[PDB]
Amino acid sequence: VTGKTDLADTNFDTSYTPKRTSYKIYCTYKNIHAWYDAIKCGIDAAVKELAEKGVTVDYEWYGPAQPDAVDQVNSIETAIGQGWDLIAVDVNQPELTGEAINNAVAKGIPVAVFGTSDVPNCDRAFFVGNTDPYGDGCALAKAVCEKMGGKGQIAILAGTIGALAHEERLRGFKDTIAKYPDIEIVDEQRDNDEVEKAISITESWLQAYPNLGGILCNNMSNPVGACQAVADAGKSGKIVIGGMDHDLRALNALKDGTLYVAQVQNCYDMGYKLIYNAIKTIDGEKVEESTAVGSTSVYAQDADKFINMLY
């Protein structure tokens, strides 16, 4: 990912003059994944604009190879004493990280939260990100259920056990499917955000459920794997697949018909607006406490537009 989408705000006020000429921001996010590359695009755009105004923003971009709730706490505690003006967090475990945030705030360092979900019950100054993973799950599930004519069998790739946004999307899937009583959810399995596991899960489902009619995929990786397995079995377009996020393989699968709908989030503004609001916070200025970046459903007719803008 090198650009943004049409979701990004075109009317965001950046006229405020920062009360310093230099700022240092430590970013710590749940785990390495291509998804975060789309946020980093917004960060790098804000730093450029602020460099033209004689303002130098330096930042570190840290995430572990695999998610580790304690590592995230440790990353916050250790950054406190390293001379950062603000700590930006994409959250692993809200309760554990909340307390780590409060410790950083108590010791004089403001904290921003960004990305997939907010920690509203902690002393973070502001949030920029998706305020509604449940709704994203509902959007995908409604689209797939309606495309299936409100009847048939759906299987659910459910991602990583206990991951907040995965679990909220999954709750949205099920609450929505419940509104179509002629649809049966035959199974749900945890791919753990691994493409190969999503492939193997889907392969098993194609054997076990000859009548499978739809698959819902709650993270950026599992639509890739569902589409690959469905295409390899010759079932592209005959099983209705809906998934999260913007992997180029998923967006290309929209064009070829294997994927029906992708739910793309405004990752760019998560990073772009994080920087500008961080500065207002470091300076003591007020800023919107919760900025919702938004998301939208992308079908085949919008695939090329999103591919071109993101890649």
Residue numbers in the entry: 58 to 368
Which lines from the publication concern this structure?
Clostridium thermocellum has extensive potential in lignocellulose biorefineries as an environmentally prominent, thermophilic, cellulolytic bacterium. Previously, five putative sugar transporters, denoted A to D and L and belonging to the ABC transport systems group, were identified in the genome of C. thermocellum, and the solute-binding lipoproteins (SBP) of these ABC transporters were shown to bind different dextrins by isothermal titration calorimetry (ITC) assays. To gain insight into the structural mechanism of the transporter specificities, 11 crystal structures, both alone and in complex with appropriate saccharides, were solved for all 5 putative sugar-binding proteins, thus providing detailed specific interactions between the proteins and the corresponding saccharides. Combined genetic, biophysical, and structural studies have provided solid evidence that transporter A and transporter B are the major glucose and cellodextrin transporters, respectively, among the five potential sugar transporters in C. thermocellum.
The unliganded CbpC and CbpD structures were determined to 2.00 and 1.50 Å resolution, respectively. A Dali search using the CbpD structure revealed similarity with several monosaccharide-binding proteins in the closed conformation. A nearly closed substrate-binding pocket between domains I and II was found in the unliganded CbpD crystal structure, which is suitable for accommodating a monosaccharide. The small substrate-binding pocket suggests that CbpD cannot bind to cellodextrin, in agreement with our titration and genetic experimental results. CbpD has been proposed to be the transporter of xylose, but we could not detect any xylose-binding ability in either ITC or NMR experiments. For CbpC and CbpD, no interaction was detected for all of the tested carbohydrate substrates in both ITC and NMR experiments, suggesting that transporters C and D are not responsible for glucose or cellodextrin transport.
